[PDB]
């Protein structure tokens, strides 16, 4: 079957045939749709069929299908799972997981890039330390002093689900947050319950608006253990407003590097529980999410407050007025500084080149409509305009519960 | 089965079970979302009409009465004998009502059931649809204090007699090719502005042209007639600060009125049924204004303030953008005419969401629709999870009129 999309600002009309290859599912059926909902151990018995898969999808992208050296691939991964129940990844074919997850990943309006991904293979890795020092290698290499370079450190796979690699932060750079008594946040309101487990753990607290979070790593099944990363490696932007003097008094700041670490990577039914990816910022992430959700910084009260804007009416447009103001900063600011970062009219932009090339050469592209339009401006970014279907591929990135909900502590 | 919709700024759950009610299809598949694709006999008419009638019934706590029995009995003797069937003025009122309570793309939805029904179904002619449609409009626009209605025009038959306005909204601006190679006025209208020319219409060829309401009675070839000029109230665009802005020559009219839809009630079928509400700012200042293949103005806009267009990054059309929608919604409230910003009725939404949910046991609701073309996060709606599916009483998308008429 073949499925079509339109884009209603140009008329252009894509066919799908990719969706043909996709089984995992939606969410959706026939008299629902989930589309914005954000969430809608493994048997000998499921595991061959998945590893076969993806190496018919392997070795058909290197021009080898069919070959001897498919063949016999096939077979040394079909004795192995028989004999020890999993089976290892070659580096190639690592590599080539790891790329397939980030091209598949519907959510990412970044995808352009999908084929420049460096890759760590960790899965030599055995201890906490380790993990420690290999994603402080990563952290240095992917800020490369503000040219950021996309890069994923792969950590140790699943095995008996007792003996799991975790990265207990959601992102390897990221703000703590702290309840006060009288019922306030200081710092990332997002981060409290992550903050907590922290100074429980054994953190010292610095207490202030922007204090980078320590590591919490968990090696093996092991009860996680505490790091910081070096400050050195932590490249931050001093956030300042190109006509706007006043605004560098607000005291802002942010990260430059990006790093989500809480995500499953699968790769031919094996599962990657520990697998930091990074990329670089859309300024919109920053200027809009971050700092203008009333469930996160709320700035938004404030900038308008010094910008003098009627605020006695919603319809004066005042939150409207801040927020894009804001934004100006978070791109001139890392802009300034060199460090990399993209708008969202030239990352949608760049989004529809790419998925217009994947509907050639691939017959698809799956993209997630509510998470690849920018929370401002939606309609003048090209993406609005554009019809998508959204399914799930494997290789694939994953969400996995929080690790201190399930963790079977040794003390 | 039983399913949870979260708000994830203020945690707030929902549990739906108003789905397990829904009768029609998503597009959607266990496979395959289309959640962001615009349009994914007597036989059966009688299980249509028996599901409206329990649910009226039930509505007005009368469930299995005999004046209920009594009903369904006489509509199915009536489908029996005819082919067809009547609705009582009461279940006509009732299925509009509901048909929009259950819009799962109208943000505006807190005001469903107040809803003016005008019951047109003793219409015969285009002309009886034109005084018809003239008194909706006049009634609706109130001097500037909108209030919502519906007109409902006599329901399908064979279907080769149809009632439809062939018109996308009661009121729009014509769009005309230009030798230039560029277009004047709305290009969203260019197509239907030359069948009106085709039908007879001496056309202006201005920017903001209303244009002419071309009407089909009983299957007939459709018919022109302009709206008192006097009836469609309009808005000269100026901006609270920029003194320049009224240079543009901008304006939009008052009356949102979409008149190419078909209205479904108990499995009978109103292919001609204008309705109309009041505007969010957002739909003129951000689609209308600044859509590329709109009117556009962008451009324009951000010259006359002088930002810098050189680079993207600038974001001299977030900044635009944003001055083009105060300038809107001030022009609306100087001149008296009701309008909604996008933070008040998204706001709005939210609270009828939750009475729906506390009252009915849901809300239908696509977010690709609800969430504004302009600043989505700063709203509530988006941080609202939200589950999409089709109740009926509806409204449902019909092909223009012209790809399917034999004149
Ligand atoms: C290279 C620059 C990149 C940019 C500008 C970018 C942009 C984005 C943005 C804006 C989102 C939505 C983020 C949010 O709203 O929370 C996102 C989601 C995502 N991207 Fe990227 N991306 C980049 C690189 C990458 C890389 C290297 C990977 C993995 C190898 C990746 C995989 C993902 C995934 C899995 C999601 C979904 C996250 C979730 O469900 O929470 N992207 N991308
Ligand atoms: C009273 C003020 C109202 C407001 C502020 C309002 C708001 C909106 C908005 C902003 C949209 C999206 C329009 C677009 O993007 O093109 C919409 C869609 C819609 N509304 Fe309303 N609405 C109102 C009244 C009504 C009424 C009175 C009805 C029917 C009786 C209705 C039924 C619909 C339908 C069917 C859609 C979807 C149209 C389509 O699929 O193209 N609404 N509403
Ligand atoms: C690699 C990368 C580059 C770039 N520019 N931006 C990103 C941001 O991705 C951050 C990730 C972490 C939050 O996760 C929230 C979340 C919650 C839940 C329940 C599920 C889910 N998939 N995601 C939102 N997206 C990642
Ligand atoms: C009643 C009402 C109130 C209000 N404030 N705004 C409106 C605007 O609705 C206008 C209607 C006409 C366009 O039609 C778009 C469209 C195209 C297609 C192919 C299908 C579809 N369902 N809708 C967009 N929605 C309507
Ligand atoms: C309920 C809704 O799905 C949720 O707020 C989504 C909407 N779209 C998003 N889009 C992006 N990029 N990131 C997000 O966190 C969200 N949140
Ligand atoms: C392709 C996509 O579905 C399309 O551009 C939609 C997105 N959301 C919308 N939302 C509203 N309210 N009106 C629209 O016309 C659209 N267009
Ligand atoms: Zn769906």
Redesign the pocket.
């Known amino acids: 079957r073949f499925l079509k999309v339109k884009n209603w600002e140009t008329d252009v009309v894509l066919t799908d045939t990719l969706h043909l290859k996709s089984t995992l599912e939606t969410g959706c059926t026939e008299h629902i749709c989930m589309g914005?909902?954000?969430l809608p151990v493994r048997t000998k018995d499921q595991l061959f069929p998945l590893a076969k898969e993806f190496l018919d999808q392997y070795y058909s992208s290197i021009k080898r299908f069919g070959s001897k050296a498919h063949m016999d691939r096939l077979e040394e991964v079909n004795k192995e799972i028989e004999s020890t129940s999993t089976y290892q990844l070659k580096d190639t074919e690592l590599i080539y997981g790891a790329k397939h997850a980030w091209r598949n990943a519907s959510?990412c309006?970044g995808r352009i890039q999908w084929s420049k991904l460096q890759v760590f293979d960790a899965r030599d890795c055995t201890t906490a330390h380790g993990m420690f020092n290999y994603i402080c290698n990563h952290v240095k290499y992917a800020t490369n002093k503000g040219n950021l370079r996309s890069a994923i450190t792969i950590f140790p796979q699943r095995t008996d689900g007792k003996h799991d690699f975790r990265v207990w932060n959601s992102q390897l750079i990221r703000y703590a947050g702290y309840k006060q008594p009288d019922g306030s946040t200081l710092g990332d309101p997002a981060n409290v319950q992550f903050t907590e487990i922290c100074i429980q753990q054994g953190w010292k607290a610095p207490r202030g608006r922007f204090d980078v979070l320590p590591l919490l790593l968990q090696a093996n099944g092991n009860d996680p253990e505490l790091f910081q990363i070096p400050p050195e490696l932590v490249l931050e932007v001093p956030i300042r407003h190109p006509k706007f003097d006043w605004f560098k008094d607000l005291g802002l700041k942010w990260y430059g590097l990006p790093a989500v670490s809480n995500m499953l990577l699968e790769i031919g039914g094996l599962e990657f529980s520990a697998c930091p990816f990074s990329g670089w910022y859309m300024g919109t992430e920053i200027g809009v999410?971050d700092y203008c959700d009333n469930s996160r910084y709320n700035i938004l009260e404030e900038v308008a407050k010094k910008m003098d804007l009627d605020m006695r009416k919603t319809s004066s447009l005042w939150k409207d007025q801040a927020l894009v103001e804001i934004n100006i900063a978070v791109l001139y600011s890392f802009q300034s500084d060199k460090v990399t970062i993209v708008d969202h009219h030239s990352a949608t932009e760049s989004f529809i080149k790419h998925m217009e090339n994947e509907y050639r050469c691939r017959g698809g592209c799956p993209a997630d409509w509510?998470?690849?339009?920018?929370?401002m401006s939606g309609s003048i970014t090209p993406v609005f305009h554009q019809e998508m279907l959204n399914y799930r591929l494997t290789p694939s990135f994953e969400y996995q519960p929080d690790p201190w909900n399930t963790h079977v502590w040794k003390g």
Not at 370 to 375: D, H, K, N, Q
Request: glycine share 0%; charged share 15%; net charge positive.
């Open positions: 914005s909902i954000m959510r309006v999410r509510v998470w690849i339009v920018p929370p």
